[PDB]
Scaffold this active site. Structure first.
Site, mmCIF file in Angstrom:
data_model
loop_
_atom_site.group_PDB
_atom_site.id
_atom_site.type_symbol
_atom_site.label_atom_id
_atom_site.label_comp_id
_atom_site.label_asym_id
_atom_site.label_seq_id
_atom_site.Cartn_x
_atom_site.Cartn_y
_atom_site.Cartn_z
ATOM 1 N N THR A 159 30.622 157.369 -3.865
ATOM 2 C CA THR A 159 30.213 157.980 -5.142
ATOM 3 C C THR A 159 31.279 158.164 -6.166
ATOM 4 N N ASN A 180 36.625 159.029 -1.665
ATOM 5 C CA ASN A 180 36.131 160.403 -1.759
ATOM 6 C C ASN A 180 37.115 161.377 -1.146
ATOM 7 N N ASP A 261 20.412 159.306 -2.236
ATOM 8 C CA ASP A 261 21.553 159.343 -1.270
ATOM 9 C C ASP A 261 21.442 160.470 -0.233
ATOM 10 N N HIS A 265 21.265 159.454 3.780
ATOM 11 C CA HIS A 265 22.213 159.710 4.846
ATOM 12 C C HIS A 265 21.447 160.238 6.077
ATOM 13 N N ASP A 308 25.033 154.099 -8.187
ATOM 14 C CA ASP A 308 26.465 154.007 -7.870
ATOM 15 C C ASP A 308 26.739 153.075 -6.711
ATOM 16 N N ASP A 687 49.500 143.561 -7.787
ATOM 17 C CA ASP A 687 48.902 144.245 -8.947
ATOM 18 C C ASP A 687 47.729 143.451 -9.521
ATOM 19 N N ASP A 691 52.822 137.093 -11.313
ATOM 20 C CA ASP A 691 54.249 137.533 -11.210
ATOM 21 C C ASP A 691 55.099 136.756 -12.198
HETATM 22 C C1 LIG Z 1 42.673 146.754 -15.119
HETATM 23 O O1 LIG Z 1 42.718 147.297 -16.453
HETATM 24 C C2 LIG Z 1 43.883 148.162 -16.589
HETATM 25 C C3 LIG Z 1 43.908 148.767 -17.998
HETATM 26 O O2 LIG Z 1 44.223 147.777 -18.974
HETATM 27 C C4 LIG Z 1 45.184 147.417 -16.295
HETATM 28 O O3 LIG Z 1 46.136 148.488 -16.027
HETATM 29 C C5 LIG Z 1 47.212 148.545 -16.983
HETATM 30 O O4 LIG Z 1 48.151 147.487 -16.704
HETATM 31 C C6 LIG Z 1 49.500 147.514 -17.264
HETATM 32 C C7 LIG Z 1 50.477 146.632 -16.364
HETATM 33 O O5 LIG Z 1 50.479 146.986 -14.902
HETATM 34 C C8 LIG Z 1 50.035 148.964 -17.371
HETATM 35 O O6 LIG Z 1 51.109 148.998 -18.331
HETATM 36 C C9 LIG Z 1 52.248 149.776 -17.853
HETATM 37 O O7 LIG Z 1 52.049 151.093 -18.357
HETATM 38 C C10 LIG Z 1 53.143 152.015 -18.389
HETATM 39 C C11 LIG Z 1 52.638 153.259 -19.149
HETATM 40 O O8 LIG Z 1 51.617 153.807 -18.292
HETATM 41 C C12 LIG Z 1 51.176 155.161 -18.597
HETATM 42 O O9 LIG Z 1 50.426 155.267 -19.818
HETATM 43 C C13 LIG Z 1 49.145 154.559 -19.867
HETATM 44 C C14 LIG Z 1 48.530 154.577 -21.292
HETATM 45 O O10 LIG Z 1 48.033 155.884 -21.690
HETATM 46 C C15 LIG Z 1 48.258 155.163 -18.752
HETATM 47 O O11 LIG Z 1 46.959 154.574 -18.643
HETATM 48 C C16 LIG Z 1 48.943 154.985 -17.392
HETATM 49 O O12 LIG Z 1 48.057 155.489 -16.354
HETATM 50 C C17 LIG Z 1 48.458 155.108 -15.012
HETATM 51 O O13 LIG Z 1 49.335 156.024 -14.361
HETATM 52 C C18 LIG Z 1 48.784 157.332 -14.090
HETATM 53 C C19 LIG Z 1 49.743 157.973 -13.102
HETATM 54 O O14 LIG Z 1 50.905 158.182 -13.877
HETATM 55 C C20 LIG Z 1 47.382 157.384 -13.450
HETATM 56 O O15 LIG Z 1 46.725 158.665 -13.643
HETATM 57 C C21 LIG Z 1 46.454 156.284 -13.932
HETATM 58 O O16 LIG Z 1 45.398 156.197 -12.934
HETATM 59 C C22 LIG Z 1 47.231 154.956 -14.091
HETATM 60 O O17 LIG Z 1 47.664 154.565 -12.767
HETATM 61 C C23 LIG Z 1 47.547 153.134 -12.536
HETATM 62 O O18 LIG Z 1 48.505 152.345 -13.289
HETATM 63 C C24 LIG Z 1 49.906 152.536 -12.903
HETATM 64 C C25 LIG Z 1 50.843 151.733 -13.839
HETATM 65 O O19 LIG Z 1 50.811 152.255 -15.202
HETATM 66 C C26 LIG Z 1 50.082 152.181 -11.406
HETATM 67 O O20 LIG Z 1 51.430 152.442 -10.983
HETATM 68 C C27 LIG Z 1 49.107 152.995 -10.545
HETATM 69 O O21 LIG Z 1 49.121 152.544 -9.194
HETATM 70 C C28 LIG Z 1 47.664 152.870 -11.029
HETATM 71 O O22 LIG Z 1 47.256 151.528 -10.767
HETATM 72 C C29 LIG Z 1 50.333 155.662 -17.404
HETATM 73 O O23 LIG Z 1 50.101 157.076 -17.467
HETATM 74 C C30 LIG Z 1 54.427 151.384 -18.968
HETATM 75 O O24 LIG Z 1 55.469 152.347 -18.754
HETATM 76 C C31 LIG Z 1 54.753 150.029 -18.300
HETATM 77 O O25 LIG Z 1 55.933 149.398 -18.901
HETATM 78 C C32 LIG Z 1 56.914 148.775 -17.997
HETATM 79 O O26 LIG Z 1 56.660 147.375 -17.726
HETATM 80 C C33 LIG Z 1 56.991 146.516 -18.852
HETATM 81 C C34 LIG Z 1 56.412 145.096 -18.720
HETATM 82 O O27 LIG Z 1 55.837 144.692 -19.981
HETATM 83 C C35 LIG Z 1 58.511 146.506 -19.069
HETATM 84 O O28 LIG Z 1 58.950 145.552 -20.056
HETATM 85 C C36 LIG Z 1 58.920 147.900 -19.517
HETATM 86 O O29 LIG Z 1 60.363 147.907 -19.530
HETATM 87 C C37 LIG Z 1 58.361 148.958 -18.546
HETATM 88 O O30 LIG Z 1 59.300 148.876 -17.458
HETATM 89 C C38 LIG Z 1 59.944 150.125 -17.146
HETATM 90 O O31 LIG Z 1 59.233 150.746 -16.062
HETATM 91 C C39 LIG Z 1 59.228 150.009 -14.821
HETATM 92 C C40 LIG Z 1 58.339 150.740 -13.801
HETATM 93 O O32 LIG Z 1 58.763 152.115 -13.689
HETATM 94 C C41 LIG Z 1 60.692 149.852 -14.375
HETATM 95 O O33 LIG Z 1 60.753 149.141 -13.141
HETATM 96 C C42 LIG Z 1 61.538 149.133 -15.452
HETATM 97 O O34 LIG Z 1 62.879 148.857 -14.941
HETATM 98 C C43 LIG Z 1 61.434 149.909 -16.808
HETATM 99 O O35 LIG Z 1 62.058 151.219 -16.868
HETATM 100 C C44 LIG Z 1 53.510 149.117 -18.394
HETATM 101 O O36 LIG Z 1 53.155 148.780 -19.749
HETATM 102 C C45 LIG Z 1 48.989 150.017 -17.771
HETATM 103 O O37 LIG Z 1 49.484 151.359 -17.657
HETATM 104 C C46 LIG Z 1 47.812 149.964 -16.806
HETATM 105 N N1 LIG Z 1 46.830 151.015 -17.128
HETATM 106 C C47 LIG Z 1 46.025 151.610 -16.277
HETATM 107 C C48 LIG Z 1 45.046 152.633 -16.876
HETATM 108 O O38 LIG Z 1 45.993 151.447 -15.060
HETATM 109 C C49 LIG Z 1 45.099 146.593 -15.029
HETATM 110 O O39 LIG Z 1 46.276 145.721 -14.984
HETATM 111 C C50 LIG Z 1 43.808 145.794 -14.924
HETATM 112 N N2 LIG Z 1 43.751 145.079 -13.687
HETATM 113 C C51 LIG Z 1 43.601 143.726 -13.529
HETATM 114 C C52 LIG Z 1 43.610 143.200 -12.141
HETATM 115 O O40 LIG Z 1 43.446 143.002 -14.514
HETATM 116 CA CA LIG Z 2 27.045 158.166 -4.172
HETATM 117 CA CA LIG Z 3 51.871 140.592 -9.770
HETATM 118 CL CL LIG Z 4 37.193 157.522 1.173
HETATM 119 ZN ZN LIG Z 5 26.308 159.129 0.105
#
Ligand SMILES: *[C@@H]1O[C@H](CO)[C@@H](O[C@@H]2O[C@H](CO)[C@@H](O[C@@H]3O[C@H](CO[C@H]4O[C@H](CO)[C@@H](O)[C@H](O[C@H]5O[C@H](CO)[C@@H](O)[C@H](O)[C@@H]5O[C@H]5O[C@H](CO)[C@@H](O)[C@H](O)[C@@H]5O)[C@@H]4O)[C@@H](O)[C@H](O[C@H]4O[C@H](CO)[C@@H](O)[C@H](O)[C@@H]4O[C@H]4O[C@H](CO)[C@@H](O)[C@H](O)[C@@H]4O)[C@@H]3O)[C@H](O)[C@H]2NC(C)=O)[C@H](O)[C@H]1NC(C)=O
Ligand SMILES: [Ca+2]
Ligand SMILES: [Ca+2]
Ligand SMILES: [Cl-]
Ligand SMILES: [Zn+2]
Ligand SMILES: Cc1cc(COc2n[nH]c3c2CCN(C(=O)c2ccc(S(N)(=O)=O)c(F)c2F)CC3)c(C(C)(C)C)cc1Cl
Ligand SMILES: [K+]
Ligand code: NA
Length: 805
Positions: A159, A180, A261, A265, A308, A687, A691
């Protein structure tokens, strides 16, 4: 602390939240234990129940009643939903004929058609047919509106991950609600269904629809409903909000039902006890629709009826126990049930070893009903790895089963007969989608689609710019009468080089050999023409893929195939070829077994070499265009070019060779020719995205030849299989896969047998969307077709699932 001594007088289901220690009158107040003392009395009235009766018509308003039947109720906006039917001789909505809604027919002051999301928990896709005799309101929405035969949830099919995906358009790995139950090691905090940590905003990532709307000046009703608020009151609340003044009234609303749901169950998906929950949900839908009709909103509002996830038969007896596999079961923490997630019980135990746990769980019993994976090895279509809250060790549980740590967990926690959470391609996990309203199409069936797509559509329905998400915006345009989103194809970033003959054979010192020194103006011009692209129309049917990042690559033409060859990664990004239904399969001749030929169009410095493969005792090589499918013995030589070679573990070569030698031809014969695009994928940080070079963790020993983590193929033909793939006038048909490039076949328990008994089963498990491959390669396919771009977007989201009807 909450000072609960203020009052909800006039504030019942106020839309904005007031801050502690002030007392609340909104939906969440109960969930925080913060409601004003008179919340129940004022806001959860039940007197006289939910329906007008003849004797109540024209009554004197009694404010104690749950709903009203007095003459003033319509202008107050608090009539019982059947008021007009009982008291004014109106018909229920369900009894009215379906009539096309060509334009919104809304009251003055409505700036846009409202959206109501009506979410039903556990509503399995086949209930639409199987429960049809007892769901007349739902069946009318379905038949008169736009519907899919089913909608695909996200994994895990639980859910919270699915509702939050509906709200955000994001995979669970990206929104952060990955189950969950969860442990976040950075937080050192645990999320559970019971208790308080789940209310902390740090769990909930992305941007859900109510935030998207609010930021863009579109008001929203609450999405969360406290469990103690009965369904009839949730409906009346929605209807009361729809009577607000224009400046205060939301444009987007949600309703949630815990049924079917809850009963599923207890009773199983098709238990005889399930008929009543389905009837009761239908009645709730009728209350809403009658309520809308009373408000003159029934041809104004867009309604989405969505589930869902589904529900499968699962009983206590079908539980596998880790205590039957592991000696060290007390050194692990398992998140159990219809999926498994394993981590160390203590981070201070340095004798914890994931490798030994995986091996102890791998193919240990003949009918074993789960399969262990390191998360990076899960099917990429699950998109279930890139989050610290997802444990490294995963267990994929068979449908109809559970996994638990020890037997005592199952009898010190049979009760239940249904559950869900399994792989999102499993038929029992599929759920429902209906859209009804002015913006949806009339009496229209659409193909099955994924729930990640809906956020974009809901944004389209509200005039909102969606936050970045995992939908493909435009892929659901065929659901809509208006408000379509019309995207442009992305721009190509890197243009190809088209090298001619630039190097002499002796400039290469690659350690390669080939028995090819064997010698005509008729066929000398013919081979020149093939190397300049004369058969390219046959083998590249949909234009060349666009490269959406900065790199250096070459287009290479050949008689039988075309490729985009990367000078950076020393191999093709893509290799495209067409195999007709008539094509013949041949062998790799004895004299060519180990043949690798330099490509005189590409420099030695930008080529692979055979010596590296000799020296790397773990790594072998394959070919992207298969030598087995050469058009002639002379064309076969092209297939042994160093520019067609890719690194392959011997274990993977078993898979790859069977695909290339047997399956491609099978598909061409079944589909009336196929076009195949194949290539490498590098996703070492799991991710889901291509790469960069500096992310590669493994090279062929002693070289700069990067080792892919996966191999893909996209296999396209004509939807009308009476036309051959290479002369198709209409829509296309696709299936694709993303195979893991593994050094063993431990995933396949029957891999000691002939490839005809296990390879295709593996390939089905790793089925993929074109869109998945796009993300993983930075390539954009199908750029030159005769089809509309929205149609192509739909095609790129298609998943071939291999499940029966
Ligand atoms: C599905 O769709 C989504 C949405 O479009 C795609 O996800 C995006 O992908 C981008 C690339 O992976 C990513 O961009 C990075 O964002 C960083 C800023 O992030 C914060 O702010 C945003 C915007 O408001 C916010 O949404 C983010 O939210 C994440 O993190 C919080 C936890 O803090 C969570 O609550 C939330 O659920 C979300 O988590 C998810 O994403 C993070 C990564 O952001 C994962 O780690 C988690 O596991 C989880 O999946 C954040 O709050 C920004 O800082 C990054 O910039 C770095 O990389 C660039 C490359 O261009 C580099 O040039 C820069 O220098 C910079 O590097 C520096 O940091 C590195 C890492 O620390 C370090 O190694 C270097 O040396 C440098 O210091 C980057 O732009 C974007 O945030 C996410 N967004 C979301 C919502 O997930 C997703 O890819 C799609 N999937 C597919 C398969 O297509
Ligand atoms: Ca459900
Ligand atoms: Ca990759
Ligand atoms: Cl679970
Ligand atoms: Zn259920
Ligand atoms: C339309 C929409 C609505 C909602 C509101 O959803 C809820 N409102 N009220 C409840 C919920 C669901 C969870 N709750 C459960 O009872 C529950 C049931 C089954 C299972 S199970 N066993 O079926 O997995 C669970 F785990 C559960 F928790 C508590 C009641 C959301 C958000 C994101 C706000 C939730 C997003 C959207 Cl788009
Ligand atoms: K080798
Ligand atoms: Na095996």
């Amino acid at each position: 602390w909450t000072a609960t001594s203020g009052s909800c007088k006039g504030r019942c289901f106020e839309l904005q939240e007031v801050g502690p220690p002030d007392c609340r009158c909104d939906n969440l107040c109960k969930s925080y234990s913060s409601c004003c003392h008179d919340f129940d009395e004022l806001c959860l009235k039940t007197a006289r129940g939910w329906e007008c009766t003849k004797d109540r018509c024209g009554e004197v308003r009694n404010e104690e009643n749950a709903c009203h039947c007095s003459e003033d109720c319509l202008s107050r906006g608090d009539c019982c939903t059947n008021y007009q039917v009982v008291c004014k001789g109106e018909s229920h909505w369900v009894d009215d004929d379906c009539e096309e809604i060509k334009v919104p027919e809304c009251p003055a002051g409505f700036v846009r058609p409202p959206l109501i999301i009506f979410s039903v928990d556990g509503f399995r896709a086949s209930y639409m047919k199987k429960g049809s005799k007892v769901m007349p309101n739902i069946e009318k929405l379905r038949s008169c509106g736009t519907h899919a035969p089913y909608m695909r949830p996200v994994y895990p099919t639980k859910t919270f991950p699915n509702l939050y995906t509906l709200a955000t358009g994001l995979y669970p790995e990206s929104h952060g609600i990955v189950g969950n139950s969860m442990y976040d090691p950075v937080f050192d905090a645990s999320f559970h269904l019971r208790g308080r940590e789940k209310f902390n905003h740090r769990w909930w990532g992305g941007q859900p629809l109510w935030i998207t709307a609010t930021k863009q000046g579109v008001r929203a009703g609450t999405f969360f409903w406290s469990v103690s608020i009965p369904h009839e009151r949730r409906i009346l609340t929605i209807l009361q909000w729809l009577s607000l003044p224009d400046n205060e009234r939301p444009s987007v609303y949600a309703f949630y039902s815990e049924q079917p749901d809850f009963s599923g169950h207890k009773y199983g998906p098709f238990g005889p006890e399930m008929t009543n929950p389905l009837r009761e949900i239908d009645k709730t839908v009728g209350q809403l629709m009658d309520g809308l009709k009373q408000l003159r909103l029934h041809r104004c509002v867009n309604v989405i009826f969505v589930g869902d996830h589904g529900m499968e038969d699962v009983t206590c007896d079908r539980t596998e126990f880790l205590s039957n596999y592991l000696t060290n079961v007390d050194d692990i923490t398992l998140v159990p049930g219809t999926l498994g997630r394993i981590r160390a019980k203590s981070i201070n135990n340095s004798k914890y070893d994931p490798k030994t746990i995986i091996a102890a769980l791998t193919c240990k019993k003949p009918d074993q009903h789960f399969k262990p994976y390191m998360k990076q090895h899960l099917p990429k279509r699950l998109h279930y790895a890139n989050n610290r809250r997802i444990e490294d060790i995963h267990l994929l549980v068979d449908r109809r089963w559970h996994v638990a740590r020890k037997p005592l967990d199952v009898y010190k926690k049979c009760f239940f007969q249904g559950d869900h959470g399994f792989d999102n391609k499993v038929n029992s996990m599929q759920t429902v989608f209906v859209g009804y309203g002015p913006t949806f199409k009339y009496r229209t069936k659409v193909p099955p689609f994924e729930n990640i797509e809906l956020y974009n559509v809901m944004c389209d329905l509200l005039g909102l710019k969606p936050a970045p998400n995992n939908g493909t915006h435009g892929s659901l345009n065929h659901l809509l009468r208006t408000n379509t989103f019309r995207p442009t194809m992305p721009d190509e970033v890197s243009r190809p080089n088209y090298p001619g003959i630039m190097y002499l054979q002796s400039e290469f010192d690659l350690g390669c050999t080939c028995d090819d020194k064997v010698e005509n103006k008729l066929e000398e011009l013919n081979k020149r023409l093939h190397t300049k692209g004369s058969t390219k129309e046959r083998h590249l049917l949909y234009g060349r893929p666009a490269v959406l990042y900065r790199t250096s690559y070459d287009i290479l033409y050949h008689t039988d195939f075309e490729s985009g060859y990367s000078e950076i990664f020393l191999m093709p990004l893509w290799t495209s070829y067409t195999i007709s239904k008539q094509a013949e399969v041949s062998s790799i001749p004895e004299h060519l077994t180990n043949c690798v030929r330099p490509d005189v169009r590409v420099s030695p410095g930008f080529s692979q070499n055979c010596l590296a493969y000799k020296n790397d005792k773990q790594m072998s090589y394959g070919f992207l265009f298969p030598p087995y499918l050469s058009s002639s013995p002379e064309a076969k030589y092209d297939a042994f070019l160093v520019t067609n070679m890719v690194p392959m573990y011997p274990a993977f070569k078993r898979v790859w060779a069977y695909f290339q030698r047997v399956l491609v031809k099978k598909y061409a014969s079944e589909r009336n020719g196929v076009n195949v695009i194949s290539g490498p994928i590098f996703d070492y940080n799991y991710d889901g995205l291509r790469d960069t070079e500096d992310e590669i963790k493994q090279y062929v020993e002693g070289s700069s030849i990067p080792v892919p983590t996966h191999y893909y193929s996209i296999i396209t033909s004509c939807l009308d299989f009476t036309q051959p793939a290479d002369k198709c006038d209409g829509p296309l048909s696709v299936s694709s896969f993303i195979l893991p490039h593994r050094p063993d076949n431990d995933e396949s328990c029957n891999s000691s047998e002939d490839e005809s008994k296990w390879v295709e089963e593996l390939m089905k498990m790793h089925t993929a969307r074109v869109r998945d491959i796009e993300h993983l390669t930075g390539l954009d396919f199908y750029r030159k077709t005769s089809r509309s771009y929205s149609e192509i977007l739909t095609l790129k989201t298609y998943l071939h699932t291999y499940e029966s009807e």
